[PDB]
C-alpha cells in the first residue's frame, strides 16, 4: 500500500534531483535580453496609434 | 421679494442644488453604473421623471420672478407647464408603481418569479409614461393667451374637471395604494423571521409617506380651495401668494425621491460612492 | 458594413436568443443539498420526483426547484462552493441514526462561509423514527458527552436542532428545521413553504426595504 | 448528408406565375440566409434574390423586385420564390444557395441542383475579358475578371467570389472573398487580386477541372456576376 | 522499510533545496535595477461585451487575436469578435457548470469543462451549420478545471481528482495520464511549442510536465496557499503562478526555483488569473479584488490597475500578437483593454 506510494516518491525525487541547473543569473540576463529585444512589438507597453489601432 | 414669494424662490433654489446633483448622480449609477434588474427600472425612470421636474425647474423661477407675464411666445407657455405637469404625474405614478412592486414581491412570490422579469417593468414604466402623457392633454389645450392688463400674461369643464381628475388620479389613488401597500407589507413582515425587522421597515415606509403626504397635500389642498374660493378677496388672494411655495413643495418633493428610494438600496449606495 | 451588416443580423438574433434563455432560466429556484454521507440525501432525493454533480429539477406548485446533489464531487469543496452562490436556499440532510460530529463541522463551515452570509439554509433531520428507536437502545448522550437533561425523545431531537441551529451567526439568515422518518411525503412541502419565505425575504433587501 | 432539392419549374405561359420551393435536409436551415440564382440557357449566373437568418432582410434584383418574393419556412425547412407576371425573359434554371455569414464564414458554399423554368446604374460591374479558353490538362490556367468599383473595402477584406460550374451540374463554391478557398476545393485552385481587377489561378488543371468559371461580388446587393469564362479540353 | 524511504526522499528533498539555494548568486531585481521603468500604463476599456447573464468563469482567445470564447455559469459559450463587438456563436451547454474553456488553435474546435468531471469538444465547423459536441471525454473522477489545446486532435486536461490526463479526441481515450499533485489541479498552461505543460495545484506547489513522455520533469514549491491561475512566459523558459495568498511570482523553468514575487502591502485580495504582454515585459495579474493589476515583469511593481470590473475578475488573456488584453469578471463583462 504506502510502500509502493514511497517507492513512487522516491523515484520522483531521484529522478527531479538529476537536473541541470543553470545560474540565476543567466536565467534573468536571458529574461531581460528578451524583454528589450521583442519591446518595439509589445502593442501594451507602447501605445499604439488609434489609425493603427484595430481597437480604437 | 415678499415673504410668500421670497420664500418660493428660497425653497426652488434649495430644491434645485439639492436635486440636480442628486438626480445626475443616481441617474448617472442607475443608468451605466449599475445594473438593469427589476427594481432598478423603477429607480430609473423615477430619476429621469425628477430630473426633468428639477430641469424644468428654472422656468418656475423664471414665472416666480417676472411674476408671470412670460415673454415668449405661445408655444413656450404651450410646451413648458405640461411639461411640468407630465414630469410630476410622471414621478407620483413611479412611487405608486414602486410601493405596488413592493407589495407584489411579498404577497405573491411565486408569481413573482416565474412572471417578474426585466421587460415586466419596463412596460408597466412604458405604460406609466403613456398614462402621464394622457392625463396632461386637458393642461396642453384648454391653456389660453391672455393680456387682461399692461403685460401679457399666460393663463386659462375647463378648470373644474380637470382639477377633480387631477386631483384624484395625484392624490387619492396613488396615495391610497402606498398607504395600504406600505401597511400590509409591515403587516406581513409580523409573521416569522421577520419579527426581529419590522422596526426598520416600519420607519422606512412611515418615511416614505410622511415625505409624499407632506410634499404633495398643500398643492392639492390649495388647487381645490382656489375653485371654492372666488379671487378679488383675501381668501383667495392668500391662495395665489401661496400656490408658489405650494409648487416648490411639489418640486421639492423630486429632489426628496432619490434619497428615499434609490439611496436607501445599500448595494446602489456603495455604487454610487465608488463612482463618485 | 458591407456583408458585415448580415454579421451584426446574426450576432442580434443570437442576443436576443441569448436574452429569452436568461429570461427563462432565471424563473427556476436553484437549491443546493449538502449532508454528510448516507444522511437520507439520495432518500429525499428520490421521493421528491426525479456522477459528479447530480441535478434533480422539478415543479412544485408553479415552482420549477433546481436541487443540485453536489455530494459526488470527493475533493476539495472550497475552490468549486463559490459557483453555487446566488442559490435560493441550502438543503442540509442530517442522519439523526449515525456521523453527528461531521454534520456540525460542514454545517458550521457551510453556514459561515464567506459566499452564503445570506443564503438561509433548510436543515433536515431525517431518519427520526430509527433516532428514537435507538434512544430506547442506547443513550444520547453517547454523540455529546456535555448533554444533561432527560433521555427522550423529544429533548433529544430538540437538543440536536439547538446544537445545529446554534452554528450560524450572520442576522440575514435564518436556518428552517425539520423532523423526517423517510416514511413521508411532507419532505417537499416543507422544502416549498420555506422557499417561499427565503424568496419574500430576499425580494424584500433587493428592493432595500427589508 | 447536406441536400438541397428544389422543384416547381415547367412550361409557363407568359404573364403567368409560378411558385418554386427549395426542399432543404441535412444543415440547419434555420440559421442559414438562403439565396435564388437563376441561369439562362445560354448566358452566366444572374442573383435574383435573398433571404436572412431570420427572414429579416430581403433583397432583389434591379428586374426582380415587385415581381418575385422570397420567403422561408424554418420549420419546414424550406425556401419560397413567388413569382408573378413572369416574362418571356425570365426563363432560367434557377439554384439555391445557402449562404451562412459571420466572421469567416464561406457563403455560397452549397448550391441546390435547380428548376429549370421554360416560359414561353450604381451596380458593380464585373466583366471578364475572355469567355473561352483552350487548356490541357496538366497545364496551368488563369482567369481574370475586372470590376468597376474598388472591392477592397476598409477593413481589408475584398468581397470577391469563384464559382466552378461543371458541365451539367450546380456552381460549387471555390474562392470566397478572392483569397480564401473554400472547403473541398482541391488546394490546387488559388485566387488573388488588388481591388478591381482580380485572377483566378488553376495549376495542373485537371479533366474534372474543366467547366465555366464564374466571378461574383458580395459587397452590395444587388450582386453582379462575370459573364463566365469557360474552359474546355 | 518505510522509515527508510521517508528518509531518502526527506534527504532528497534537502538536497534539491540545497542545490536550488546554490544556483542563486543573485536575484532578478538586482539584474533589472539599471533598465529604466516602464512608466504608468493607462490602459482604456476599448470594447465591452455584454452578452454573458452569470458569473464568466473562463475565455480563451483565437489564435488570430481576434476571436475570443468566453464561458460562463449561464450554460453558455459565446464566441466573441472583439473587433466588431459582435457574437459568432453561442453554443449551449448541456452541463451549466463550467469552469473552464478552450479555444484551439486551428480556430476549428471549442472544449468545455467543469463540475460535470467530462471535457466536452465542440465542432465549430460543421458542414450542418451548428456547433455539435465532437467528443465528450469522460475519464476523470473529479471536476474539470483547465484544458488546454495541443492541437486539433489532442488536448491536455486538469481535473479536480489531482491528476492531468492527455487526451485524444478522435478515440475519447487517455493517451496519457499525469499523476503526482496532492490536491486539486485548478490551473494548466502549455508551453509555447506545446511539447511541454505546467499545472498549478491547489496543494500550493506547481509541476512542470511534458506530454510526449508523460511524467513530472520539476515541481516548484513557494506558494503558501492554493495556486489559482498558471502562464507560460513568451519565451518559454520561464512562468508565472498566481496564488490564493495575494501573490504571484515568476519560476525560471532553467533555474529551477522563483525569480521574482509581485505583492504589494494592501494587496489582501488572492490571484485569478495571470497573463504576460507579448514581449513578456507586463505581467498582467487578475485579483479578487475586483482589479486587474499590470505588473512590470522585471521591475516587480505595479505599472498601472485596470479597473472596472464590479467583481472579482476571474479570467484575463492576451492576445497573441499582443494587441489587447480581454478581462472576464463575476459580473458578466467581457472588457478589452488597449
Redesign the interface.
Same mark, same amino acid.
Given at each position: 500500500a504506502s510502500i509502493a506510494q514511497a517507492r513512487k516518491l522516491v523515484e520522483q525525487l531521484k529522478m527531479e534531483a538529476n537536473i541541470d541547473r543553470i545560474k540565476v543569473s543567466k536565467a534573468a540576463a536571458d529574461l531581460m535580453a528578451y524583454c528589450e529585444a521583442h519591446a518595439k512589438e509589445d502593442p501594451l507597453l507602447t501605445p499604439v496609434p488609434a489609425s493603427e489601432n484595430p481597437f480604437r | 421679494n415678499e415673504p410668500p414669494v421670497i420664500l418660493s424662490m428660497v425653497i426652488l433654489s434649495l430644491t434645485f442644488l439639492l436635486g440636480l446633483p442628486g438626480n445626475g448622480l443616481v441617474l448617472w449609477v442607475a443608468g451605466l453604473k449599475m445594473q438593469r434588474?427589476v427594481?432598478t427600472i423603477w429607480f430609473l425612470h423615477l430619476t429621469l421623471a425628477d430630473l426633468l421636474c428639477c430641469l424644468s425647474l428654472p422656468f418656475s423661477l423664471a414665472h416666480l420672478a417676472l411674476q408671470g407675464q412670460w415673454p415668449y411666445g405661445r408655444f413656450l407657455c404651450k410646451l413648458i407647464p405640461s411639461i411640468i405637469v407630465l414630469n410630476m404625474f410622471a414621478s407620483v405614478f413611479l412611487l405608486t408603481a414602486i410601493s405596488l412592486?413592493?407589495c407584489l414581491?411579498?404577497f405573491k412570490?411565486?408569481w413573482?418569479?416565474?412572471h417578474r422579469?426585466v421587460?415586466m417593468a419596463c412596460s408597466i414604466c412604458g405604460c406609466i409614461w403613456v398614462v402621464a402623457f394622457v392625463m396632461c392633454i386637458p393642461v396642453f389645450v384648454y391653456r389660453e393667451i391672455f393680456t387682461t392688463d399692461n403685460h401679457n400674461r399666460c393663463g386659462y369643464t375647463p378648470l373644474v374637471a380637470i382639477t377633480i381628475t387631477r386631483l384624484v388620479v395625484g392624490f387619492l389613488l396613488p396615495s391610497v395604494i402606498m398607504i395600504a401597500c406600505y401597511s400590509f407589507?409591515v403587516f406581513?413582515?409580523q409573521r416569522?423571521?421577520?419579527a426581529?425587522?419590522q422596526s426598520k421597515?416600519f420607519r422606512?415606509?412611515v418615511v416614505v409617506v410622511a415625505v409624499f403626504l407632506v410634499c404633495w397635500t398643500p398643492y392639492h389642498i390649495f388647487g381645490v380651495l382656489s375653485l371654492l374660493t372666488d379671487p378679488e378677496t383675501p381668501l383667495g388672494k392668500t391662495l395665489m401668494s401661496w400656490d408658489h411655495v405650494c409648487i416648490a413643495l411639489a418640486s421639492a418633493n423630486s429632489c426628496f425621491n432619490p434619497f428615499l428610494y434609490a439611496l436607501?438600496?445599500?448595494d446602489?449606495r456603495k455604487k454610487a460612492r465608488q463612482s463618485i | 458594413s458591407?456583408?458585415?451588416?448580415?454579421?451584426?443580423?446574426?450576432?442580434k438574433?443570437?442576443?436576443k436568443?441569448?436574452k429569452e434563455?436568461?429570461?427563462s432560466?432565471?424563473?427556476d429556484?436553484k437549491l443546493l443539498l449538502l449532508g454528510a454521507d448516507n444522511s437520507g440525501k439520495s432518500t429525499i432525493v428520490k421521493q421528491m420526483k426525479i456522477?459528479?454533480?447530480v441535478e434533480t429539477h422539478f415543479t412544485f406548485?408553479?415552482?420549477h426547484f433546481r436541487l443540485f446533489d453536489?455530494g459526488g464531487?470527493?475533493?476539495?469543496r472550497?475552490?468549486?462552493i463559490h459557483?453555487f452562490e446566488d442559490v435560493t436556499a441550502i438543503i442540509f440532510c442530517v442522519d439523526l441514526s449515525d456521523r453527528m460530529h461531521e454534520s456540525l463541522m460542514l454545517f458550521d463551515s457551510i453556514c459561515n462561509n464567506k459566499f452564503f452570509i445570506d443564503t438561509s439554509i433548510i436543515l433536515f433531520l431525517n431518519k427520526k423514527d430509527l433516532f428514537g428507536e435507538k434512544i430506547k437502545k442506547s443513550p444520547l448522550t453517547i454523540c455529546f458527552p456535555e448533554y444533561t437533561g432527560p433521555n427522550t425523545y423529544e429533548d433529544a431531537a430538540a437538543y440536536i436542532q439547538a446544537q445545529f441551529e446554534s452554528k450560524n451567526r450572520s442576522?440575514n439568515k435564518?436556518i428552517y428545521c425539520h423532523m423526517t422518518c423517510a416514511t413521508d411525503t411532507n419532505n417537499a412541502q416543507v422544502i416549498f413553504d420555506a422557499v417561499?419565505?427565503i424568496?419574500?425575504?430576499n425580494?424584500?433587501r433587493?428592493?432595500?426595504?427589508? | 448528408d447536406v441536400q438541397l432539392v428544389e422543384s416547381g419549374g415547367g412550361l409557363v405561359q407568359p404573364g403567368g406565375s409560378r411558385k418554386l420551393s427549395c426542399s432543404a435536409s441535412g444543415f440547419a436551415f434555420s440559421?442559414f440566409?438562403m439565396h435564388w440564382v437563376r441561369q439562362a440557357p445560354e448566358k452566366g449566373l444572374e442573383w435574383v434574390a435573398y433571404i436572412?437568418?431570420?427572414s429579416?432582410?430581403i433583397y432583389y434584383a434591379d428586374t426582380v423586385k415587385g415581381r418575385f418574393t422570397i420567403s422561408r419556412d424554418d420549420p419546414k425547412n424550406t425556401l419560397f420564390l413567388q413569382m408573378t407576371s413572369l416574362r418571356s425573359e425570365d426563363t432560367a434554371m434557377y439554384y439555391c444557395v445557402r449562404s451562412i455569414?459571420?466572421?469567416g464564414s464561406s457563403?455560397f458554399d452549397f448550391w441546390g441542383q435547380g428548376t429549370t423554368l421554360t416560359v414561353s446604374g450604381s451596380d458593380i460591374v464585373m466583366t471578364q475579358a475572355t469567355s473561352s479558353v483552350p487548356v490541357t490538362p496538366g497545364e496551368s490556367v488563369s482567369i481574370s475578371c475586372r470590376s468597376s468599383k474598388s472591392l477592397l473595402?476598409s477593413?481589408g477584406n475584398t468581397?470577391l467570389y469563384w464559382f466552378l460550374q461543371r458541365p451539367g451540374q450546380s456552381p460549387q463554391l471555390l474562392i470566397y472573398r478572392m483569397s480564401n478557398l473554400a472547403s473541398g476545393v482541391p488546394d490546387r485552385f488559388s485566387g488573388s487580386g488588388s481591388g478591381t481587377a482580380f485572377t483566378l489561378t488553376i495549376s495542373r488543371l485537371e479533366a474534372e477541372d474543366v467547366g465555366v468559371y464564374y466571378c461574383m461580388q458580395?459587397?452590395?446587393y444587388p450582386l453582379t456576376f462575370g459573364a463566365g469564362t469557360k474552359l474546355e479540353l | 522499510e518505510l522509515d527508510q524511504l521517508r528518509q531518502e526522499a526527506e534527504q532528497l528533498k534537502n538536497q534539491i533545496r540545497d542545490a536550488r539555494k546554490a544556483c542563486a548568486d543573485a536575484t532578478l531585481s538586482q539584474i533589472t535595477n539599471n533598465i529604466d521603468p516602464v512608466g504608468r500604463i493607462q490602459m482604456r476599456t476599448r470594447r465591452t461585451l455584454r452578452?454573458?447573464?452569470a458569473?464568466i468563469?473562463a475565455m480563451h482567445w483565437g489564435t488570430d487575436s481576434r476571436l475570443l470564447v468566453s464561458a460562463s455559469? *449561464?450554460?453558455?459559450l459565446?464566441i466573441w469578435?472583439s473587433y466588431?463587438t459582435?457574437?459568432?456563436?453561442?453554443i449551449?451547454l448541456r452541463?451549466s457548470?463550467v469552469?473552464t474553456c478552450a479555444y484551439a488553435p486551428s480556430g476549428n474546435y471549442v472544449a468545455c469543462g467543469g463540475?460535470?468531471?467530462i471535457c466536452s469538444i465542440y465542432n465549430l465547423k460543421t458542414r450542418e451549420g451548428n456547433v455539435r459536441v465532437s467528443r465528450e471525454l469522460a475519464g476523470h473522477?473529479?471536476?474539470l478545471?483547465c484544458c488546454r489545446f495541443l492541437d486539433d486532435n489532442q488536448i491536455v486536461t486538469s481535473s479536480?481528482?489531482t491528476t492531468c490526463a492527455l487526451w485524444d479526441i478522435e478515440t475519447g481515450q487517455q493517451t496519457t495520464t499525469f499523476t503526482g499533485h496532492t490536491? *486539486?489541479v485548478?490551473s494548466l498552461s502549455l508551453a509555447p511549442d506545446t511539447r511541454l505543460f505546467v499545472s498549478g495545484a491547489?496543494d500550493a506547489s506547481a509541476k512542470l510536465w511534458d506530454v510526449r513522455e508523460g511524467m513530472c520533469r520539476q515541481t516548484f514549491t513557494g506558494h503558501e496557499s492554493?495556486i489559482n491561475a498558471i502562464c507560460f512566459f513568451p519565451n518559454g523558459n520561464a512562468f508565472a503562478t498566481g496564488s490564493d495568498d495575494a501573490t504571484c511570482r515568476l519560476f525560471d523553468l532553467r533555474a529551477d526555483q522563483e525569480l521574482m514575487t509581485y505583492s504589494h502591502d494592501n494587496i489582501i485580495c488572492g490571484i485569478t488569473s495571470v497573463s504576460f504582454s507579448k514581449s513578456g515585459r507586463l505581467l498582467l495579474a487578475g485579483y479578487d479584488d475586483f482589479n486587474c493589476n499590470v505588473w512590470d515583469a522585471l521591475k516587480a511593481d505595479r505599472a498601472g490597475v485596470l479597473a472596472g470590473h464590479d467583481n472579482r475578475v476571474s479570467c484575463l488573456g492576451v492576445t497573441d500578437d499582443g494587441m489587447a488584453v480581454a478581462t472576464g469578471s463575476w459580473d458578466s463583462f467581457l472588457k478589452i483593454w488597449n
Open positions: - | 434588474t427594481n412592486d413592493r414581491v411579498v412570490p411565486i413573482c418569479q416565474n422579469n421587460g407589507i406581513r413582515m416569522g423571521r421577520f426581529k425587522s421597515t422606512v415606509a436607501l438600496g445599500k446602489f | 458591407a456583408e458585415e451588416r448580415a454579421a451584426l443580423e446574426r450576432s438574433a443570437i442576443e436568443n441569448l434563455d436568461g429570461i432560466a432565471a424563473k429556484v456522477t459528479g454533480i406548485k408553479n415552482l453536489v464531487q470527493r475533493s476539495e472550497k475552490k468549486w459557483c442576522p435564518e417561499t419565505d424568496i419574500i425575504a425580494n424584500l433587493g428592493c432595500g426595504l427589508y | 440559421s440566409g436572412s437568418s431570420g429579416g432582410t455569414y459571420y466572421y457563403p473595402h477593413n468581397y458580395h459587397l452590395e | 452578452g454573458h447573464l458569473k468563469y455559469q *449561464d450554460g453558455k459565446i469578435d466588431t459582435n457574437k459568432v456563436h453561442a449551449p452541463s457548470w469552469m463540475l460535470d468531471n473522477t473529479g471536476y478545471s479536480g481528482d490536491g *486539486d485548478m491547489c492554493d
